[PDB]
Symmetry: C2
């Protein structure tokens, strides 16, 4: 609970300290990168993570819509080009889907997206729509915290995904530099740390939803049906 404004370097350290709560520490993530995850768990992960990825560009556009500074927009738009392509990351993820046995329609349809994942992700969007652009922009800085096994995974799609993700052009540090410039009072600094925590909560909550469904055999409505019964529509956009 910051009492006296921290310096920019010290603030950066505090922000980086929040990485301790990054989602790589979630048992579900651990199990996937341990090879202890089942195939159900893997396909679930890709389908659900895809929703996040298709939301990012909407989230970034929301930020731009709220940002009257042309130079900031000139940088921010590169995030949208990265995701949308013109291949792009959405496309790269479609290839990973294929590699793990899911069709493009399976993914594009968003039919497999668990409501807990949806709500967590949409929270990110709705923050970006409503928050001052600086705050929303800064929340992107968690990207700084970043099979075989699984023989059944198609090498070619994989490498394809891994590879497309590697040509992104956005300035991943932008959020950080902004936060250090913008958060120049104790009050802003504490609030920024809480915004970071919000973002970390989104990522952890996505994984909790996946844990319940694919690892604990407790998907939505499991006591009442064996079919997927959850809503599958971005109701206010579609």
């Amino acid at each position: 609970l910051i009492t006296d404004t921290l310096s920019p370097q010290a603030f950066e350290e505090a922000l980086r300290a929040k990485g301790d709560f990054y989602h790589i520490h979630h048992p579900y993530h651990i199990a996937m990168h341990n090879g202890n995850a089942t195939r159900e768990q893997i396909q679930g992960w890709v389908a659900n993570r895809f929703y996040y990825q298709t939301t990012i560009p909407l989230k970034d556009a929301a930020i731009m819509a709220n940002c009257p500074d042309a130079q900031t927009r000139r940088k921010w738009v590169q995030r949208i080009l990265d995701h949308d392509g013109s291949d792009g990351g959405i496309e790269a993820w479609l290839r990973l889907g294929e590699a793990v046995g899911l069709s493009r329609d399976d993914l594009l349809s968003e039919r497999h997206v668990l409501p807990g994942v949806r709500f967590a992700v949409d929270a990110y969007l709705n923050f970006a729509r409503r928050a001052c652009w600086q705050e929303a922009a800064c929340s992107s800085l968690t990207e700084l915290f970043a099979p075989q096994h699984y023989p059944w995974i198609k090498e070619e799609g994989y490498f394809s995904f891994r590879s497309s993700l590697s040509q992104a052009n956005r300035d991943v540090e932008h959020g950080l530099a902004l936060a250090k410039a913008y958060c120049d009072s104790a009050e802003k600094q504490n609030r920024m740390l809480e915004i970071l925590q919000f973002k970390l909560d989104i990522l952890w909550s996505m994984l909790d939803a996946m844990t319940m469904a694919y690892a604990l055999q407790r998907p939505p409505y499991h006591t009442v049906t064996d079919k997927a019964a959850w809503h599958t529509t971005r109701l206010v956009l579609e």
Copy 2:
């Protein structure tokens, strides 16, 4: 998947059929009303449900803000008076909190609210903000689907809560009558069923979050800390 517009009576039956997915069928809810719930589970439930309750009036006001029909507003505002009082339901829930051993500050602070609960609830609000008023209004119709044991529970607060909830004046059927009037095409009807499913998903997801935290010993960041580390702020409103 409605192909030919249903009649109003048949549509009502379809809507009521969605009650099969109501949250009373969630293992967490079952355990509470079975007396199989632990005290941790109960206090968690009250603290987390409280967030829903404090959001309802915001949700209802959002609907009104989107509703240029004065007569509709004249009815809808009664929902806000019910919750806000002037005692009201928010107050009634504060008394139940007391009955189960939680202080007013504990509840009002929203500090115990799990992020999964928060995201699910905020989804409701953000739907209400953005959707046409008719759609948002109709989603309220799930209210139509509606300790000892637990000796440690204070009878007086309880009865107090149970009792205040019983003097609400809103027209719980309003959403239904609107849906029957408004949803006069196959397309609107299918969409309304999907909106209902959305609402049901919110309620189930709230309970999943509670299940993970209080029943499966898997609250957020459990692999990294034993303290509550999640964000506790309505960032865009506070």
